[PDB]
Amino acid sequence: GSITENTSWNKEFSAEAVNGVFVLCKSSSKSCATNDLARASKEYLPASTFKIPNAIIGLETGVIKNEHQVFKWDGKPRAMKQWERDLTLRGAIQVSAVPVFQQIAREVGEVRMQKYLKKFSYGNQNISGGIDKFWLEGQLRISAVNQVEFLESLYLNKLSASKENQLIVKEALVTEAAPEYLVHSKTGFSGVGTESNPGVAWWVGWVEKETEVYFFAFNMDIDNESKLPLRKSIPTKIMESEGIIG
Amino acid sequence: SITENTSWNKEFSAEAVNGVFVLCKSSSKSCATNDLARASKEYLPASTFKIPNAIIGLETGVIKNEHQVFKWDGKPRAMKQWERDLTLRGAIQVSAVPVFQQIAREVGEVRMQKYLKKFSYGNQNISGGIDKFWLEGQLRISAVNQVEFLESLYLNKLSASKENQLIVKEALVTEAAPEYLVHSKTGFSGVGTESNPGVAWWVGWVEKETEVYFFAFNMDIDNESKLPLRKSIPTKIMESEGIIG
Ligand SMILES: *C(=O)[C@H]([C@@H](C)O)[C@H]1CC(SCCNC=N)=C(C(=O)O)N1
Ligand SMILES: *C(=O)[C@H]([C@@H](C)O)[C@H]1CC(SCCNC=N)=C(C(=O)O)N1
Ligand code: NA
């Protein structure tokens, strides 16, 4: 397990006047590279990336029955029209249907939710702030490095959850599929934050390319929703210039 | 039950293709096709056999697990794309025959026969050599049967652990989009011989919103230049029904 600083990559950040970090790890050499060692260890609210552990915990606790469970839309207004539908597990993840996962956390409960974030070594493991908000506005925080450790565990089925439930969540996280490579990933965006205290935007996941696997985690400060696409454009550019997905 | 849709014939005739498309919304209990007779006609599975072969490899422990790497011994293989180490998904996606031939040999005739019976896989005939019965032997399966088989897989209802079915299902993802996932497998038996065409396949399913469509396409083929039609005809149909694209 090694990490090195690669201040080169900074060009793709500077080009777009973005402050953030990319962490990219090659599984076979167990070696990671980042543009910013300090920021890679800095902990931010997970925002919708929390839907990964939350989904796993919901399956393990039985709250989510199985891979085919449909979360039925009860008709009442949701903060996004995208969310105003019936949704599969993948559907609710792809669209980041927060209220689906707020109810899941509610049924998981504080005690099991804390037990699992400790077993998963997930961030600071602080779920203070309300059972259906701690990852959105409460005290939970996780690093880019911790994300890639967590994702590597999931990939290897080594989290303290059934392998079946880890496989279920992995397939729901597939976002791009090609003959030579598969991408599993999850976006996050906490909001634009306050004056002097921007929000955070995330892109985490891993790339299966030939016999190699690359785990990655991107975060950036964000005070303008206009800039959201940059959470994929900068890591994708980085990953292309490494020959991984381009 | 299977019901004929005449409308779908346009895409075949335009291309001078003799083939069938089978499409089933939600379940295999009602399927639509351009050709009732051909929907249930049984053909060599060719590379589509990699799906049951992968499941059986896992169930028997021949494939140790999802992360197994099939190492290349460096000796010539029939396609340059196969001359590399491969994961399970990789070996499926490039249709690395010799990887699956060794799998078949290690599974062996007795176990292969048992699982094909459990899976209701076509005519369940594995004669013709343990490492080639799905390539040039007597094995045959229809488009309708592929749909039934894939539906069982999708539902984790094959006689196989849920874990192993999940592994193979992930290995079969070929298109991911926000609204839908496609799990699929292509096949091409070759160009056949005079008056006896080969067969080309595309089978799979589409998870879209909360709906699932099972599909199975085959055509006669005697010229490899026609091979792109195996995807474009069923894609065109599924795009015109509003399922993908
Ligand atoms: C998670 O990161 C959020 C969740 C908290 O809403 C979802 C929503 C979005 S983008 C729209 C949010 N607008 C806020 N004013 C994403 C995303 O990853 O793009 N995830
Ligand atoms: C399985 O259907 C075959 C396997 C038995 O060889 C592979 C090969 C091809 S096409 C490559 C060009 N063929 C030249 N002989 C496919 C395919 O799905 O297209 N699968
Ligand atoms: Na693909």
Author numbering:
A (entry chain B): 20 to 265
B (entry chain A): 21 to 265
Copy the relevant paper text.
In summary, the crystal structures highlight the importance of residue 117 in OXA‐10 variants for carbapenemase activity. This study also illustrates the impact of a single amino acid substitution on the substrate profile of OXA‐10 and the evolutionary potential of new OXA‐10 variants.
Carbapenemases are the main cause of carbapenem resistance in Gram‐negative bacteria. How β‐lactamases with weak carbapenemase activity, such as the OXA‐10‐type class D β‐lactamases, contribute to anti‐bacterial drug resistance is unclear. OXA‐655 is a T26M and V117L OXA‐10 variant, recently identified from hospital wastewater. Here, we have solved crystal structures of OXA‐10 in complex with imipenem (IPM) and ETP, and OXA‐655 in complex with MEM in order to unravel the structure–function relationship and the impact of residue 117 in enzyme catalysis.
